[PDB]
Amino acid sequence: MNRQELITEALKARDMAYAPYSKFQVGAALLTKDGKVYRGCNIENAAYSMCNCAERTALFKAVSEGDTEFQMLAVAADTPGPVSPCGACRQVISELCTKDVIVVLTNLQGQIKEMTVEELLPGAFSSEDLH
Amino acid sequence: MNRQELITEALKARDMAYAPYSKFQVGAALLTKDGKVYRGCNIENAAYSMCNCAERTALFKAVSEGDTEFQMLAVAADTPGPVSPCGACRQVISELCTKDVIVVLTNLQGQIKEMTVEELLPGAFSSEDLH
Amino acid sequence: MNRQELITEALKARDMAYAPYSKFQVGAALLTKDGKVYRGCNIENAAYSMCNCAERTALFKAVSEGDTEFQMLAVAADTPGPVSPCGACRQVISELCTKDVIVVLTNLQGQIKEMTVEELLPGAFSSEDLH
Amino acid sequence: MNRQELITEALKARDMAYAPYSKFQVGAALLTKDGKVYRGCNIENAAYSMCNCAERTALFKAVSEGDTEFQMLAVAADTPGPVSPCGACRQVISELCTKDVIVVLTNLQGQIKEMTVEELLPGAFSSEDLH
Numbered sequence: 001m002n003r004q005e006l007i008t009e010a011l012k013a014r015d016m017a018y019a020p021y022s023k024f025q026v027g028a029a030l031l032t033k034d035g036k037v038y039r040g041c042n043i044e045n046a047a048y049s050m051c052n053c054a055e056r057t058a059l060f061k062a063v064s065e066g067d068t069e070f071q072m073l074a075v076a077a078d079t080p081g082p083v084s085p086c087g088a089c090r091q092v093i094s095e096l097c098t099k100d101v102i103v104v105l106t107n108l109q110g111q112i113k114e115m116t117v118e119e120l121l122p123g124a125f126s127s128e129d130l131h
Numbered sequence: 132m133n134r135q136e137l138i139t140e141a142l143k144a145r146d147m148a149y150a151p152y153s154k155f156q157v158g159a160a161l162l163t164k165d166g167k168v169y170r171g172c173n174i175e176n177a178a179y180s181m182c183n184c185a186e187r188t189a190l191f192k193a194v195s196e197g198d199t200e201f202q203m204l205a206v207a208a209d210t211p212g213p214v215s216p217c218g219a220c221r222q223v224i225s226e227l228c229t230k231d232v233i234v235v236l237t238n239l240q241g242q243i244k245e246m247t248v249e250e251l252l253p254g255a256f257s258s259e260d261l262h
Numbered sequence: 263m264n265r266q267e268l269i270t271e272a273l274k275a276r277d278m279a280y281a282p283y284s285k286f287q288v289g290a291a292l293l294t295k296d297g298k299v300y301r302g303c304n305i306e307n308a309a310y311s312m313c314n315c316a317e318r319t320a321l322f323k324a325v326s327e328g329d330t331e332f333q334m335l336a337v338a339a340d341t342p343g344p345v346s347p348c349g350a351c352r353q354v355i356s357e358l359c360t361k362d363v364i365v366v367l368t369n370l371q372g373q374i375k376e377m378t379v380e381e382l383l384p385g386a387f388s389s390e391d392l393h
Numbered sequence: 394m395n396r397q398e399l400i401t402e403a404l405k406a407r408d409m410a411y412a413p414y415s416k417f418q419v420g421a422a423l424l425t426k427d428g429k430v431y432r433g434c435n436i437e438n439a440a441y442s443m444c445n446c447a448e449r450t451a452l453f454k455a456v457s458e459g460d461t462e463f464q465m466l467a468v469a470a471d472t473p474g475p476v477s478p479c480g481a482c483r484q485v486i487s488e489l490c491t492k493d494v495i496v497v498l499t500n501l502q503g504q505i506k507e508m509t510v511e512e513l514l515p516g517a518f519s520s521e522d523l524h
């Protein structure tokens with residue numbers, strides 16, 4: 001499961017999105033250390049605050065199944081450049097993924113940006129800050 | 132899969148919760164029309180706003196897999212009476228579940244309250260309100 | 263400050279809304295026991311999850327100023343019937359307003375529905391449930 | 394109103410926080426181009442997802458009043474180093490503040506980190522990505 005293949009997983013996951021308000025579909029594929037893939041997509045709500053993102057859908061799915069060791073996360077959307085995870089997703093990612101996990105961002109036209117969890121949100125607010 | 136059995140599913144799902152800040156674990160089990168069960172649990176974050184609930188974890192998991200027809204949702208937590216879904220969950224439920232879906236609420240001591248999606252959030256804000 | 267006058271306050275507050283994504287403006291006016299009025303409006307974000315509602319904007323404003331005793335909350339939007347607070351707002355309302363506070367819901371055509379905080383979200387999840 | 398004075402404003406705003414669940418109070422002070430200061434503080438909810446942060450409380454307050462031109466934002470909390478805005482706040486900040494606005498982060502022991510909005514969340518997801 002290289003990043004190329006993980007991207008195709010996120011592209012497929014994108015087609016499952018429920019986004020009738022923004023008409024903006026997002027897909028994500030999370031790869032565990034054991035090689036298992038969890039797909040995620042954004043799921044909207046008439047009350048915008050309750051919309052959930054593809055990145056978080058995939059992570060929530062994994063953690064709920066007991067999988068908490070990851071190696072890579074691919075995210076895709078029909079944006080101008082590689083899709084940029086929103087702050088809420090970066091925050092959840094910084095909590096649920098170890099700082100070494102690779103984050104692969106792409107769009108639907110071959111644009112690819114790769115960065116680590118730490119780079120996605122440097123100095124992220126964490127539990128250590130609470131105590 | 133009766134409500135008794137769906138409750139045991141939610142009780143198991145509760146043990147998967149990642150809740151190091153509140154130490155309050157919640158479990159949920161969503162039953163589709165075809166009899167498939169999706170488990171969900173709350174997943175917290177040092178930045179409280181980003182915490183996700185068991186009800187929504189289960190629903191997000193189902194919808195992302197392509198399952199959008201449900202019949203029942205069980206929710207469980209160690210509360211005094213049947214656990215009460217927070218407003219955000221009721222909002223997502225009212226969007227992703229048809230008004231006839233049965234919502235079963237319970238705690239860890241046999242308290243059981245049953246209600247429909249419509250009753251969970253009567254006159255819920257919806258897409259019809261946007262247009 | 264009767265409900266009629268508080269409604270006009272919410273109608274004015276609605277014109278301050280920043281809602282370029284939904285084009286759906288909402289207004290709210292919160293009346294304290296001492297007769298002070300706090301206006302609120304929805305404020306959106308390209309990343310939908312981060313949108314904030316009029317009801318919560320008004321409440322957040324009041325609480326931050328040290329005002330925590332309220333008597334009435336008016337909410338208005340261009341909906342078919344009285345605007346329905348989303349679950350997230352009902353949740354925050356049930357926490358920050360005592361159960362006796364009156365919630366006045368209306369649209370832009372004279373539709374008016376009045377209910378108490380308790381009625382807005384009966385048996386709302388609360389701190390008592392955490393401990 | 395230099396950053397030193399804006400910090401004292403955020404320190405005062407911190408004392409208004411309603412944070413009975415985390416016992417972690419945060420303060421913020423937003424300075425407009427015209428020299429007006431809006432204070433903000435975190436406001437929690439038994440249902441963690443609904444908690445709101447100091448940064449966003451201040452911004453929501455300003456925007457609702459019609460003030461949309463800012464020059465600086467100070468944030469303070471009792472953290473080990475300068476308090477780090479959570480992803481949700483950085484997201485709202487990148488939307489409501491122009492990329493040149495100065496963000497001043499500090500704790501209660503003189504630690505000070507200064508950065509621009511762009512630096513707070515480089516390449517933030519924006520409306521341009523939606524269309």
Ligand SMILES: O=C1CCN(C2C[C@H](O)[C@@H](CO)O2)C(=O)N1
Binds near residue numbers: 311
């Ligand atoms: O973090 C990224 C950016 C945001 N989108 C979302 C949620 C929402 O349904 C839509 C518009 O913001 O894209 C994602 O799904 N992931």
Ligand SMILES: O=C1CCN(C2C[C@H](O)[C@@H](CO)O2)C(=O)N1
Binds near residue numbers: 153175186217220387
């Ligand atoms: O809707 C219900 C009530 C809220 N809890 C949550 C999320 C959070 O991690 C914890 C404390 O609010 O319980 C749920 O998981 N489901």
Ligand SMILES: O=C1CCN(C2C[C@H](O)[C@@H](CO)O2)C(=O)N1
Binds near residue numbers: 256281305315348
């Ligand atoms: O609770 C009510 C219903 C929801 N809207 C919002 C937030 C968002 O900007 C827009 C579309 O959901 O209306 C409110 O402002 N208040």
Ligand SMILES: O=C1CCN(C2C[C@H](O)[C@@H](CO)O2)C(=O)N1
Binds near residue numbers: 178
């Ligand atoms: O962005 C910063 C970091 C997070 N906190 C919050 C919200 C919550 O009440 C508490 C614990 O996460 O700190 C803030 O208020 N601002």
Ligand SMILES: [Zn+2]
Binds near residue numbers: 054089
């Ligand atoms: Zn996101």
Ligand SMILES: [Zn+2]
Binds near residue numbers: 185217219221
């Ligand atoms: Zn919930």
Ligand SMILES: [Zn+2]
Binds near residue numbers: 047315316317
């Ligand atoms: Zn709302």
Ligand SMILES: [Zn+2]
Binds near residue numbers: 446447448480
């Ligand atoms: Zn924050």
